Amino acid sequence: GNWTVFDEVLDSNVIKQLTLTGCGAACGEMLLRDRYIFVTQNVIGTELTSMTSLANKLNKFDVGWEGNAVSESSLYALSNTGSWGAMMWDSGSKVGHWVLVKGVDDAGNVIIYDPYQGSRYLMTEQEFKEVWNGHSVYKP
Amino acid sequence: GIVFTNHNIDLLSVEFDEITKNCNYTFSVDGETAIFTARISIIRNIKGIKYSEELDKFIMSIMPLQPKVSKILGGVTWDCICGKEVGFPVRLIGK
């Protein structure tokens, strides 16, 4: 979790993961919540780590979810669809970490809801693109 | 952290089908050849690659060795689709 963020605040509206692998399911719960679908991370499955398995599970409670490796250059097109999930994978880490990309602010920063501690923070677009490994869960 | 055994994994070829949007990737895994499939997905200007389930599993297993590995595979793929000459093999993972 060594990537650079600013304006971080604990935010009890962010769903906190219950286990190390739980960040995918926590993101999945928030992604569905934004679309008026209410399913707890335990029912989604706190073992789900790959984009394939996460999109597949969201499509058991909704329809139209994609789990794809996406180009850095599609950042703004992803956020135009609403919230989406991004797999963060920083240098030296042996695991990925799913975060919810809520949108981009007027200065172009990326707004992140992070289930690690249940916080909201911002990242520059450039720093976000470097840490995000391209793996993404989104609903065009 | 502990020691993750290192590997030489190269991308040997990218075969893209304009009709179906299917993509065949051939990797060398320390000399052993393997073919994986994906599908190219451009939706609402989002440039995506839908790995097969097995390709996603394979990529996830080597992300600990090279977290940029999908950026590499994706960069090569989009250049191939746009008709640029790409020199293969392209390193995915090296020791």
Residue numbers in the entry:
A (entry chain A): 3 to 142
B (entry chain C): 2 to 96
Original authors' sentences:
Here, we demonstrate that one such protease toxin from Escherichia coli, Cpe1, disrupts DNA replication and chromosome segregation by cleaving conserved sequences within the ATPase domain of type II DNA topoisomerases GyrB and ParE. Cpe1 belongs to the papain-like cysteine protease family and is associated with toxin delivery pathways, including the type VI secretion system and contact-dependent growth inhibition. The defining feature of this protease family is a conserved catalytic triad, consisting of a cysteine (Cys) thiol group, a histidine (His) imidazolium ring, and a third residue—either aspartate (Asp) or asparagine (Asn)—that orients and activates the imidazolium ring for peptide bond hydrolysis. Therefore, bacteria encode specific immunity proteins adjacent to their cognate toxin genes to prevent self-intoxication or harm to kin cells.
To circumvent this limitation, we co-purified Cpe1tox with its cognate immunity protein, Cpi1, which allowed us to obtain well-diffracting crystals. Using selenomethionine-substituted protein, we determined the crystal structure of the Cpe1tox–Cpi1 complex at a resolution of 1.87 Å. In our crystal structure, Cpe1 features a six-stranded antiparallel β-sheet flanked by five α-helices on either side, forming the typical α/β core that is characteristic of the PLCP family. The catalytic triad—Cys, His, Asp—is clearly evident and aligns with prior functional predictions. Despite sharing limited sequence identity with ABC transporter-associated proteases, a structural homology search using the DALI server identified ComA (Z-score = 16.3; RMSD of 1.9 Å across 121 aligned Cα atoms) and LahT (Z-score = 15.9; RMSD of 1.8 Å across 117 aligned Cα atoms) as the closest homologs. Interestingly, although Cpi1 binds to Cpe1 and they share a large interface (1,050 Å2), our crystal structure reveals that Cpi1 does not sterically occlude the active site of Cpe1. Instead, Cpi1 primarily interacts with a shallow hydrophobic concave region on the surface of Cpe1 that is located adjacent to the catalytic pocket. This binding region consists of a cluster of non-polar residues—L387, M390, A408, M426, W428, and V434—the hydrophobic properties of which are conserved across many T6SS- and CDI-associated Cpe1 toxins. We did not identify any enzymatic domain in or significant structural homologs of Cpi1, suggesting that its neutralization mechanism depends on binding to the hydrophobic concave region of Cpe1 rather than occlusion of its active site. However, when we mutated all four residues (Cpi1mut4), the resulting mutant lacked the ability to neutralize Cpe1 toxicity and failed to bind Cpe1 in vitro, despite being expressed at levels comparable to that of wild-type protein.
